[PDB]
Amino acid sequence: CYGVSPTKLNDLCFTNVYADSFVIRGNEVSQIAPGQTGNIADYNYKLP
Amino acid sequence: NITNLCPFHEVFNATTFASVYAWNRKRISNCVADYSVIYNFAPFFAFK
Amino acid sequence: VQSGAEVKKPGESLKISCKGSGYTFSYYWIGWVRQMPGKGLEWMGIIYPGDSDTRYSPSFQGQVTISADKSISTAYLHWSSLKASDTAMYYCARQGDLGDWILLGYWGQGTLVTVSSASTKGPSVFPLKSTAALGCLVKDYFPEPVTVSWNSGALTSGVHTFPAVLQSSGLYSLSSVVTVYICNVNHKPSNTKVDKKV
Amino acid sequence: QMQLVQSGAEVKKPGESLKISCKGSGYTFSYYWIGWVRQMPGKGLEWMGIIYPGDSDTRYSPSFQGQVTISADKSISTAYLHWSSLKASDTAMYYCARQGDLGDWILLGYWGQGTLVTVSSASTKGPSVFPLKSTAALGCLVKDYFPEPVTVSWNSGALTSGVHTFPAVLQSSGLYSLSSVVTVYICNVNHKPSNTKVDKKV
Amino acid sequence: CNGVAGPNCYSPLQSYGFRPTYGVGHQPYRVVVLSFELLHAPAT
Amino acid sequence: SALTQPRSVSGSLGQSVTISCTGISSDVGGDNYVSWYQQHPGKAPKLMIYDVSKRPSGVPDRFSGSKSGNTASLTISGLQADDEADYYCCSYALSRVVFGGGTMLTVLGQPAPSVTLFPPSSEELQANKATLVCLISDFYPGAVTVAWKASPVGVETTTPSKQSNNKYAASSYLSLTPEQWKSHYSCQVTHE
C-alpha cells in the first residue's frame, strides 16, 4: 500500500475509489509498481 | 559495436552445479548483456 | 508390456502406452524417447510425478505433449494433427537412482507406431523334397508386422522366421521353416488369422 | 475419450450419513474441477459446491455451508461426499459435473449418470410380484412396495426385444404399482437398493 | 504492410500459455489496483 | 551441436574396440556429462556406461570410458557373440539430451550356406502364379548372390536378416507365369 497503511484503512475517507482488475503472468508481478520498467509497465499498464 | 549474443543459456540451464566449498564462476565479457531472457526461465526466491 | 500399435492416418490422435515397475512414482523424473527406423534415439521431453514441470526439446515444443497417468503408474502420450514422419519406436525412460535427474536409469519396452493409408489389405497364405523340413509362404499383404506360427505355437525349437521382402508393387512376402504340421499366420492390423497345412 | 461415473442409487434412513462417491478416469483428475447438484424436482436444480483436487481449495454455496461437505482423493482420482444429520428434505437427485476444457473453471463441462436418493422411514418394505383371449403377450404385476426404484426383467435379461416397462402408479393408500409386458417366460424382479429378488412365472 | 502478419510487421497481441503444468512464475495472477485519491476533494 | 559417431565398426572376438564420440558440450558445473546406452537390435535399450569416473551396477567390468577434451571414447574389452548391439553416447551438460549418429558393433571370427529349392504349390498354379523361392541361410560372411537359369532369367531379395540366431539369412522370390515355368530351373548361389 503506497502512501496508506493496510491496517489503518477503515478510519479514512476517499473521493472516488476505482478497483482495477487484470490478470498478468507470475513473473510480471514485480513490474506492476510505480517507477518500474519492462514490457508490461511500458506497453500494457503503467503506474505514475 | 559488439553484436554477438551473450552466452546466457549456459549457466541458468545447467544440469548439475558445483559444491559450496568449490563454487565456480564463469568469466563473461565482450557480449551484449540482455537480462530480459532470464525472467522467462523461472522466478527466484531472492532477487536483491 | 506395452499396448499394440494400430495403423492410423495422420490426424487421428493415436495414443501409445508403457508399463513400468520397480520404483515409486512420487519424485522420479520420467519421459519418452523415440527412434525412427534408420536413425538414432530422439529425446522429446520428460514429466515429473508431482508438479508437471515438463521440459520439451526445442524440436518437440509443439509437436507432442505428455499425458502420463499417475494413478496407475502407466505413461501415456497424446498427439494432434500427426504427420507421416511420426513413425518411430517410442521408448519410455525414467530418472532412476543411478545418475542425475536428467540421466535415464531404466528404459521401457518400445512400440513401433506404423502409419500407412493402403486400406490395410488382407494377407494370404500359400504352401510350398527335404523329407526333413517343411514351410509355408505368406504373400499379398501390405502391412509389415505379420507373424507366422506353427500349431498355435506348440513347436518352438527348430523354428525360424525370415524377414519380409519388399515387392515392387508395395506388398511383402515372408517365408518360414520348421524342423520336422499346421502353420498359423496372424495379421494384427486387419485382425485376420489364416491357417494352412502342408 | 474421457469417462465419468457416479455410484449406485441407494435409499437410506435419516441418520445413516451415506458416502456416495464419484469415480473419474481417462484424464488427470487433479487440474479439473468437480461438483454436485441436488434439489427437489418441484423446485428445479441447485448448486452445492466444487472442489479442486490439485490442492487445498474448496468453495461451497451459501445454501450448503454446513449442510454438506465435499471432499476428493487425488491418488485414486475418486471424489467423496459426506452428509451430516440427514433429514426428510434430502430426497433429491444427485448429479455430478466437471470443469471440462470447453468453458471456464465454474462452467460445468460434463455430467454423470445420476444417483437417486430417497429419504423414507418405511423400513424398506420388500416388493411382491403377481402374474396376470390374447393367446399373444404376457406380463407381470409388482405391488406392495414403498421404494420407487424397482427393476423388472424377463428371464434374467435374456429377452430384450418386445419388452416394455410402464411407469409406476401410486395408489391412494401410499403404495406404487407398475406393469411390465413382453411380446411373445419368468419375470424376475430384483430390488437392488434392498437386495430383494422375487421370481415369478406366468 | 497493413493487414499481413507474415512479414516483419507482427501482430501486437500475443496469447499467454497458462497451464497447470507450468510452476510458479508462469501461473496467472489476479491484480487489483485500488487507486486511492486522498486530498482536499469532497469525500463520498 | 550434433554428436558424431562412426556408422559401423569392425571388432574381433577377444580383442578390444574404441567407439569415438565428439561434439560434446560443457556448462558451468562440470564436464563429465557423458553417458553411453546399450540397445540390442529389436530389443529394449539398457544403461551401460554413465559417469565414466565411476562404475555402474550390474554392468560387467569389461566396459569403461575416457575423456580427452571435447572427444570421448568407449573402451570395450572381451567382445563376444551376444555383444553385437547398438551404442550411443549422450551429453546432458546444458540440460538437453542429445544422441550420436548410431554405432553398429560387429565382431570377426571363424564362419557353407544352406541352399534349398522349393517348387511352387498347387494353390499358386491354380491362381495362374508360379513363385520360385530359393532360401539361403547359415552363412557368416555378408557376401551372397542370387541367380537362376532358364539362358539367364519381377524379382526382389533382401540380404540382411533379423538378429534371432546370430546368423545371416537372405531370400529371393522370383514371380513368373506357370506357362513359362512348365515350359522349362535351378538356383545359383555365390558365396565366399
Description:
Chain B: Glycans are attached at residues 1, 13. Chain B: This is Spike protein S1. Chain B: Disulfide bonds join 6-31. Helices cover 8% and strands 10% of the residues of chain A. By secondary structure, chain A is largely without helices or strands. The relative contact order of chain A is 0.14. Chain C has no helices and 17 strands. In chain C, the strands form 4 sheets. In chain C, strands 2, 3, 4, 7, 8 and 9 form a 6-stranded antiparallel beta sheet that branches. In chain C, strands 10, 11, 13, 14 and 15 form a 5-stranded antiparallel beta sheet that branches. Chain C has a 3-stranded antiparallel beta sheet with strand order 1-6-5, with no helix packed on it. In chain C, 32% of the residues are buried. With 192 residues, chain F is mainly β. In chain F, the strands form 4 sheets. In chain F, strands 1, 3, 4, 7, 8 and 9 form a 6-stranded mixed beta sheet that branches. A 4-stranded antiparallel beta sheet of chain F has the order 10-11-14-13. Classes of the chains: A little secondary structure (48), C mainly beta (198), F mainly beta (192). At the A-B interface, loops of A face loops of B.
